[PDB]
Design an enzyme around this catalytic site. Structure first.
Site, PDB file in Angstrom:
ATOM      1  N   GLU A  19      57.726  72.110  31.236  1.00  0.00           N
ATOM      2  CA  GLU A  19      56.345  71.827  31.598  1.00  0.00           C
ATOM      3  C   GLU A  19      56.032  72.127  33.056  1.00  0.00           C
ATOM      4  OE1 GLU A  19      53.345  70.693  31.390  1.00  0.00           O
ATOM      5  OE2 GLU A  19      53.036  69.551  29.543  1.00  0.00           O
ATOM      6  N   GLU A  35      61.667  65.929  29.601  1.00  0.00           N
ATOM      7  CA  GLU A  35      62.481  65.361  28.540  1.00  0.00           C
ATOM      8  C   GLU A  35      64.000  65.299  28.680  1.00  0.00           C
ATOM      9  OE1 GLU A  35      59.151  67.140  25.794  1.00  0.00           O
ATOM     10  OE2 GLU A  35      60.366  65.795  24.552  1.00  0.00           O
ATOM     11  N   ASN A 118      50.439  62.858  33.775  1.00  0.00           N
ATOM     12  CA  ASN A 118      50.946  64.008  33.042  1.00  0.00           C
ATOM     13  C   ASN A 118      50.653  65.362  33.676  1.00  0.00           C
ATOM     14  OD1 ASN A 118      50.645  66.143  30.724  1.00  0.00           O
ATOM     15  ND2 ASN A 118      52.106  64.591  30.023  1.00  0.00           N
ATOM     16  N   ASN A 173      45.400  65.040  28.875  1.00  0.00           N
ATOM     17  CA  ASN A 173      46.500  65.944  29.153  1.00  0.00           C
ATOM     18  C   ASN A 173      46.217  66.955  30.248  1.00  0.00           C
ATOM     19  OD1 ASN A 173      48.931  67.393  28.796  1.00  0.00           O
ATOM     20  ND2 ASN A 173      48.957  66.866  26.629  1.00  0.00           N
ATOM     21  N   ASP A 227      46.942  71.199  25.675  1.00  0.00           N
ATOM     22  CA  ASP A 227      47.963  70.679  26.562  1.00  0.00           C
ATOM     23  C   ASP A 227      47.619  71.122  27.981  1.00  0.00           C
ATOM     24  OD1 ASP A 227      50.267  69.826  27.807  1.00  0.00           O
ATOM     25  OD2 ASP A 227      51.592  70.408  26.182  1.00  0.00           O
TER      26      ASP A 227
HETATM   27 CA   LIG Z   1      50.931  68.367  29.686  1.00  0.00          CA
END
Ligand SMILES: [Ca+2]
Ligand SMILES: [Ca+2]
Length: 312
Positions: A19, A35, A118, A173, A227
């Protein structure tokens, strides 16, 4: 809806939750691996990728009081070559190229505990608009607004104020800021993933947004949705539609995408333009990799690409 199929070139592999793609003021490329975990606990990383080789180097593995972070989004600063990072566990962080970092806010301007972040977007005035889909930051037990509406939006101002500008989102997001040709910030776009909607507001000033509206609609009923997002130089908004195998392209006025970009994978997550090029680096969650393809034109300049002391 017209779909183009440009050639995707592999950049790097094995980045758990690949990301927040970002370039700093020196042209260096960075990615966050939210993650990455250690014995089931968060241990997210901030990596620098050599573009000439694809070799990875983790410069930061942020943790506060034993609590690992989940760095998910990035923006490079202008006056200093540092990265502002949205962390699902730690809030907002400022990371140096040497790997050192600082947690920005335990609480907001109103004294309320900070929420995990985020993604973020710097407007040309230097104000940072941030999405906060997670609940309270560590030490609080981790929670996220994928099902319930507790996601918030913040604006970290030039005068150091972490101001909550909105609430009640179902996983806010991606986020982007639209500017007038003269550089004035005037519209904020925020992705609400599961609802398949893109929301917009009029930016009246630092931390001042009004007239919330359903600006764009994301294709599909697949699990996922909008996203990461970014503007090209003509202000077309490119949005990664996770789970759709496409990156939607919205015109200046929004609504339905006017074109779709087919990806050779199902989960495009976030994207970022290489300064001065039509090259868009894309992170995906199927193979946990990073790719890059050529768009029709250059991206909209990021805040870090603007000049504090410029004349024109
Ligand atoms: Ca994102
Ligand atoms: Ca981006």
């Amino acid at each position: 809806i017209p779909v183009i199929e440009p050639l995707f070139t592999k950049v790097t592999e094995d980045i758990p939750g690949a990301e927040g793609p970002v370039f700093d003021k020196n042209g260096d490329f960075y990615i966050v691996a939210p993650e990455v975990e250690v014995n089931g606990k968060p241990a997210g990383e901030i990596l620098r990728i050599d573009l000439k080789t694809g070799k990875k180097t983790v410069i930061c593995k942020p943790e506060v009081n034993g609590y690992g972070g989940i760095p998910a989004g990035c923006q490079c600063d202008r006056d200093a070559n540092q990265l502002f990072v949205a962390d699902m566990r730690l809030g907002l962080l400022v990371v140096q190229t040497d790997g050192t970092f600082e947690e920005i806010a335990k609480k907001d301007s109103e004294g309320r505990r900070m929420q995990g972040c985020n993604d973020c977007a710097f407007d040309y005035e230097g104000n940072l608009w941030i999405t906060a889909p997670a609940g309270e930051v560590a030490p609080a037990d981790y929670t996220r607004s994928m099902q319930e509406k507790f996601g918030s939006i913040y604006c970290f101002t030039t005068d150091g104020q972490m101001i909550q500008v909105d609430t009640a989102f179902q996983f806010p997001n991606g986020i982007a800021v639209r500017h007038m040709n003269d550089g004035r910030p005037y519209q904020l776009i925020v992705a609400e993933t599961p609802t398949k909607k893109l929301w917009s507001y009029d930016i009246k000033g630092p931390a001042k947004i009004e007239n919330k509206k359903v600006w764009g609609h994301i294709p599909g009923t697949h699990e996922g949705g909008a996203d990461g997002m970014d503007f090209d130089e003509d202000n077309n908004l490119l949005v990664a539609n996770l789970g759709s195998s496409h990156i939607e392209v919205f015109g200046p006025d929004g609504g339905q995408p006017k074109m779709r970009i087919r990806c050779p994978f199902e989960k495009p997550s976030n994207l970022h333009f290489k300064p001065q090029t039509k090259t868009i680096f894309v992170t995906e969650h199927e193979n946990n990799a990073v790719w890059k393809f050529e768009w029709q034109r250059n991206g909209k300049k990021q805040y870090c690409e603007t000049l504090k002391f410029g004349i024109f």
